[PDB]
Amino acid sequence: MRVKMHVKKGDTVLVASGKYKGRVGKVKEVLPKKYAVIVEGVNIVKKAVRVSPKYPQGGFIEKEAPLHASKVRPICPACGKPTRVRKKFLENGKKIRVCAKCGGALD
Amino acid sequence: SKVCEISGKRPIVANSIQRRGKAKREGGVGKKTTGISKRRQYPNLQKVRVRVAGQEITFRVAASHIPKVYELVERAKGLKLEGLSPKEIKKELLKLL
Amino acid sequence: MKTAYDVILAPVLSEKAYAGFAEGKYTFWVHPKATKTEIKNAVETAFKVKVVKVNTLHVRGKKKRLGRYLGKRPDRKKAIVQVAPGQKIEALEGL
Amino acid sequence: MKLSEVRKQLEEARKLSPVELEKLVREKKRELMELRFQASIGQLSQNHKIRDLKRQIARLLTVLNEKRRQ
RNA sequence: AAUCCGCCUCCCAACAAGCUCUGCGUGGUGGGGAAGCCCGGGUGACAACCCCCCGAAGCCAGGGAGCCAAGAAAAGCCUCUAAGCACAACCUGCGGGAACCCGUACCGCAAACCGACACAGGUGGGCGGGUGCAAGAGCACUCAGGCGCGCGGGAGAA
RNA sequence: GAAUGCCGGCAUGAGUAACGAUAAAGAGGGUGAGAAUCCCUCUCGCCGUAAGCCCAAGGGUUCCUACGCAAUGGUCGUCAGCGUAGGGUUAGGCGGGACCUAAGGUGAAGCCGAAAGGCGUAGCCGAAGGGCAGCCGGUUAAUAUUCCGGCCCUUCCCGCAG
RNA sequence: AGCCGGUAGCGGGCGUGGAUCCCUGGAUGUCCGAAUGGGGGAACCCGGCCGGCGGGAACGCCGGUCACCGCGCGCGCGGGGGGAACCUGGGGAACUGAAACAUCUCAGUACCCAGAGGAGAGGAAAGAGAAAUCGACUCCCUGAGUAGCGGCGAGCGAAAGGGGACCAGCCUAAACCGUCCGGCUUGUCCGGGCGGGGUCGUGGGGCCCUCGGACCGAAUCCCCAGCCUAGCCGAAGCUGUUGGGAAGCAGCGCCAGAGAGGGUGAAAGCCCCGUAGGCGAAAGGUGGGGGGAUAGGUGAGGGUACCCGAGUACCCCGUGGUUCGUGGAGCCAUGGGGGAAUCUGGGCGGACCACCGCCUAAGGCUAAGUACUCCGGGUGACCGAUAGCGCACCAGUAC
Numbered sequence A: 001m002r003v004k005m006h007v008k009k010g011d012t013v014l015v016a017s018g019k020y021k022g023r024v025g026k027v028k029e030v031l032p033k034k035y036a037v038i039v040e041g042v043n044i045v046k047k048a049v050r051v052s053p054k055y056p057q058g059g060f061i062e063k064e065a066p067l068h069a070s071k072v073r074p075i076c077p078a079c080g081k082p083t084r085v086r087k088k089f090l091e092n093g094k095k096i097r098v099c100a101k102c103g104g105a106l107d
Numbered sequence B: 001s002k003v004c005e006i007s008g009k010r011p012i013v014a015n016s017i018q019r020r021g022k023a024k025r026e027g028g029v030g031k032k033t034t035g036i037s038k039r040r041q042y043p044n045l046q047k048v049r050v051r052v053a054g055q056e057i058t059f060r061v062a063a064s065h066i067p068k069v070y071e072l073v074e075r076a077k078g079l080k081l082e083g084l085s086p087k088e089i090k091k092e093l094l095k096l097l
Numbered sequence C: 001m002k003t004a005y006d007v008i009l010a011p012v013l014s015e016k017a018y019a020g021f022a023e024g025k026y027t028f029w030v031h032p033k034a035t036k037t038e039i040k041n042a043v044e045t046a047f048k049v050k051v052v053k054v055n056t057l058h059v060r061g062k063k064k065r066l067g068r069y070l071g072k073r074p075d076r077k078k079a080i081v082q083v084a085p086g087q088k089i090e091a092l093e094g095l
Numbered sequence D: 001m002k003l004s005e006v007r008k009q010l011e012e013a014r015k016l017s018p019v020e021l022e023k024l025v026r027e028k029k030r031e032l033m034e035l036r037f038q039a040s041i042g043q044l045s046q047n048h049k050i051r052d053l054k055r056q057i058a059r060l061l062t063v064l065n066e067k068r069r070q
Numbered sequence E: 001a002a003u004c005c006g007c008c009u010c011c012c013a014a015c016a017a018g019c020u021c022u023g024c025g026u027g028g029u030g031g032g033g034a035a036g037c038c039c040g041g042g043u044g045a046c047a048a049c050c051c052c053c054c055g056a057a058g059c060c061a062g063g064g065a066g067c068c069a070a071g072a073a074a075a076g077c078c079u080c081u082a083a084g085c086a087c088a089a090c091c092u093g094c095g096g097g098a099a100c101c102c103g104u105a106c107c108g109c110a111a112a113c114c115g116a117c118a119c120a121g122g123u124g125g126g127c128g129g130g131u132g133c134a135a136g137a138g139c140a141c142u143c144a145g146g147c148g149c150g151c152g153g154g155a156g157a158a
Numbered sequence F: 001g002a003a004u005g006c007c008g009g010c011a012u013g014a015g016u017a018a019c020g021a022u023a024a025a026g027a028g029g030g031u032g033a034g035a036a037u038c039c040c041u042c043u044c045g046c047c048g049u050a051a052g053c054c055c056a057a058g059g060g061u062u063c064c065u066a067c068g069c070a071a072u073g074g075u076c077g078u079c080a081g082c083g084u085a086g087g088g089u090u091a092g093g094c095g096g097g098a099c100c101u102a103a104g105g106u107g108a109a110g111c112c113g114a115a116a117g118g119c120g121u122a123g124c125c126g127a128a129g130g131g132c133a134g135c136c137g138g139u140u141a142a143u144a145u146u147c148c149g150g151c152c153c154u155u156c157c158c159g160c161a162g
Numbered sequence G: 001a002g003c004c005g006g007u008a009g010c011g012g013g014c015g016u017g018g019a020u021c022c023c024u025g026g027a028u029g030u031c032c033g034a035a036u037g038g039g040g041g042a043a044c045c046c047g048g049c050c051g052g053c054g055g056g057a058a059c060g061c062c063g064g065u066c067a068c069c070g071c072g073c074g075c076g077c078g079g080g081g082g083g084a085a086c087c088u089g090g091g092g093a094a095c096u097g098a099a100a101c102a103u104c105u106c107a108g109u110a111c112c113c114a115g116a117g118g119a120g121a122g123g124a125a126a127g128a129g130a131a132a133u134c135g136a137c138u139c140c141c142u143g144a145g146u147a148g149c150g151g152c153g154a155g156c157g158a159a160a161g162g163g164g165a166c167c168a169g170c171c172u173a174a175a176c177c178g179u180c181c182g183g184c185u186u187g188u189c190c191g192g193g194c195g196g197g198g199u200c201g202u203g204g205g206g207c208c209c210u211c212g213g214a215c216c217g218a219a220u221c222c223c224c225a226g227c228c229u230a231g232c233c234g235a236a237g238c239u240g241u242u243g244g245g246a247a248g249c250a251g252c253g254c255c256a257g258a259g260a261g262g263g264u265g266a267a268a269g270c271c272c273c274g275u276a277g278g279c280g281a282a283a284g285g286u287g288g289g290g291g292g293a294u295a296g297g298u299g300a301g302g303g304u305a306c307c308c309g310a311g312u313a314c315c316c317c318g319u320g321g322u323u324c325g326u327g328g329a330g331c332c333a334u335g336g337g338g339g340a341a342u343c344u345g346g347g348c349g350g351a352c353c354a355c356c357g358c359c360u361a362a363g364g365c366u367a368a369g370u371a372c373u374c375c376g377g378g379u380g381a382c383c384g385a386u387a388g389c390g391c392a393c394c395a396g397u398a399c
């Protein structure tokens, strides 16, 4: 019905695996159809660009390549630790993400 | 060569069985079948024209049920059929079946 | 609901259609089922003119392809309407 | 168009009579043809306005159909 | 039903005329307009546009004659009257208004149609100029127009 | 490992036969990375009851213009019925339909048949037959009895007069 | 919490004031198609009538309506066509087998046709058949390759009974009564309709005397659990190291009603999706289960001999069905001819007769257990691109 995404734009995630493992960064974009997130300053690649209106002088630019969503882990704004995500029902009762370590909201 | 309007009798399929030999009951070796082939047996359909409420009505009926037409005409005396078409009279008679 | 603006789809943009403006002949893409009598009313209603003549013609779609996929552009219908002496259709005078 | 604008459109439309709804549809179908003419000479960069107007017209006809089904 | 048509009789008219219809000519008017020469176009040009001859299988046509094998239908059209209706209706003249849908490019004896091919094959109708040969749609040449057939270059044996 | 097995791939024959009418070519100029093969000019030849022109079938954008040459084209290709894109088909009078009927088809009534169905006067459908009002010229790269110009005409509606 | 399908780009937009998206209901839904105003070479063309639009009468467009057949008093209801396989009925081969071939077989199969529906058929004994017996029907096992049938060849092939699945029985016709209608041949008439009554095999019912006065309960309707058409919560891991990458190896932990499985840069219970265990419907569908209605259901003697399904039973002729191919050939069915009776009537127990029994024909309905798989899901000592469906891919396509 919908791709399940434990992370969203733009909370703060630990990158727990891959060459950038350990990096903490903000989630620029989420691509559900690829099951992938973009994290600021993580997974940088060298793309060639043709001399053109958009890129005079040509050469290369720097892209953030998407990360598989499972490689990434929200960092809890309360206790500041990387965490699995629990669900909590409020009194409305809407539902929110909450940190598994402590219990703070992640929004 | 079709269907009785009173009884529903219709053509049936029967075999024609050609036989040779002297039957065992007569002291013969027995009967042998020299041919079996399908054929049809038809109801003995005939026309029956009757006057009913001043109109002529024709039935296509097996000879067996010719008196059943006249019984219907008798029982039609307790009906109001004046001014009706023959097609409408016929439907009323057959409803009494 | 059926209005004049469902019959008149777009102006026909070409050198042949423009050449007609000097005479009060304006060419439109019209709905393919639209009749000459109803194009006249539609043009008069939308552009506040008096149509004295209507010519129509079907324009069959062109067959086209994107690699493996053979297809057809949709069929269209053209209408050339003659306006009353002295009148103009300023929306098309454009150019 | 924006969601708030759509709710607002439906509320106002649901207070118009059938005769007023037809005149509004007739005017919005007029403006739609204007957009077509402009798009066809490359003078409509805000091309989203075409889709939005087509769906406005559909909502108005939907409300006009509501009012005449009873 | 009929005043029409058919039949009988009388009068007059008759290979005439009359009425009607078509073809052709003329006709207010509108067009076209060569070679050659300059770069499809300009000029020729205010173009001229007349006379004679030949002459259809086409037209007048639903013409005429002969023959036996004896040669569609129905509507349009005209006429008769019925219900009806006879302030209507129909006819004639004139005037104003109205007049929809589909096809229309291009190939079409062929490289675009039927033959698996840009295939020496097949494909119904019309026009098909001139000269000469008895005639002709035959034959030779040639007009307008269209082509030299979508591998070439040499060599000069069997 | 064999079934003249099945499917696919790739060999041999072989740089061989052939390149599709024996109507036929030559040169100059141009274009282009490239030219026997595209364009232009001159000369030559072939058809001319056609190998020219018009129409109907059938085909279905192949038409016109720009750009292009991988493949298609029996070679070549700058060209093309090929690739991409844009444009092009205009009708009261031409053809068909809102008219008629032909064979035939269908088919109220009616008849027949195990079912499916088969007949069937009228009626209806059915045309390249009947019927019905447009001729000449000009214009576009590409349509023209359709657009335009000139001169004519038909039906329907309404009205006036007789 | 992203989004404007596959689908990026150009050019523009939307969404926590809840978008995209998923489910349910509704609106719109050109033209063809049973196709249904009429015509037609499907997707085109041409009309009538009422109303509307345009200057609108001619012309055109918009909305409504207009086929035929059946039944029922011009009105109303129904029909038509489709569906993979399954089902029933009406018709119905041949190759082949018999090591030739004709009876026989293949086979009442293939196939054609009509019809049914989520199933269909069958069904409440005129049964079975030997048990002093059983007790609708359907379906499975068995009986049994038995009994039998058979150019007694090739071959064909039951039933009863036993074990199981499921379980359920009802409505009429006639006697008699009442009423309405109509016929002429005038009433104690005859006929047609509707209502009452009545439903059976220890025979039952009617009518007339006689005594005697609440429980049952649907297969119909209403409600509700339950289920389906979207979803949701869901335990527990870090560090080092080799490496492009750890989930590998190493250290030290933790969860487990969850160590099914699939992902993640390699091989992960604890990163992700899940799994165990739980939770969830406003709307539509279902509802065989629970509850409630309604329909309907109900005595005994005695007398009377009124009724108990007709071109039927029955017999003969011609055939079919069955294990039965003319056989000693009954039974069940019926094309032709003849042709009854109402229980002291009738059919059956394999010619026939007697005895002894069994059953109650010629009206109708009836869940469940059974079949199938277009569709959805689960699972394979199933395939893994010449395999597996013809198709993993834009295929019933190209050709």
Ligand SMILES: [Mg+2]
Pocket (backbone or CB within 6 Å): A004
């Ligand atoms: Mg979720």
Ligand SMILES: [Mg+2]
Pocket (backbone or CB within 6 Å): A016, A017, A018, A021, G246
């Ligand atoms: Mg890691």
Ligand SMILES: [Mg+2]
Pocket (backbone or CB within 6 Å): A021, A022
């Ligand atoms: Mg680290």
Ligand SMILES: [Mg+2]
Pocket (backbone or CB within 6 Å): none
């Ligand atoms: Mg919510």
Ligand SMILES: [Mg+2]
Pocket (backbone or CB within 6 Å): B013
């Ligand atoms: Mg049979």
Ligand SMILES: [Mg+2]
Pocket (backbone or CB within 6 Å): B015, B016, B017
């Ligand atoms: Mg016989």
Ligand SMILES: [Mg+2]
Pocket (backbone or CB within 6 Å): B023, B024, B025, B026
């Ligand atoms: Mg014997």
Ligand SMILES: [Mg+2]
Pocket (backbone or CB within 6 Å): none
């Ligand atoms: Mg003996």
Ligand SMILES: [Mg+2]
Pocket (backbone or CB within 6 Å): B030, B031, B032, B033, G325
């Ligand atoms: Mg025998």
Ligand SMILES: [Mg+2]
Pocket (backbone or CB within 6 Å): B001, B045, B046, B047
């Ligand atoms: Mg007879």
Ligand SMILES: [Mg+2]
Pocket (backbone or CB within 6 Å): B046, B047, B048, B049
């Ligand atoms: Mg007789």
Ligand SMILES: [Mg+2]
Pocket (backbone or CB within 6 Å): B064, G336
């Ligand atoms: Mg008989």
Ligand SMILES: [Mg+2]
Pocket (backbone or CB within 6 Å): B063, B064
């Ligand atoms: Mg008899």
Ligand SMILES: [Mg+2]
Pocket (backbone or CB within 6 Å): C001
């Ligand atoms: Mg609409």
Ligand SMILES: [Mg+2]
Pocket (backbone or CB within 6 Å): C015, C016, C019, F140
């Ligand atoms: Mg031009």
Ligand SMILES: [Mg+2]
Pocket (backbone or CB within 6 Å): C037, C038, C041, C042, G061
């Ligand atoms: Mg109009």
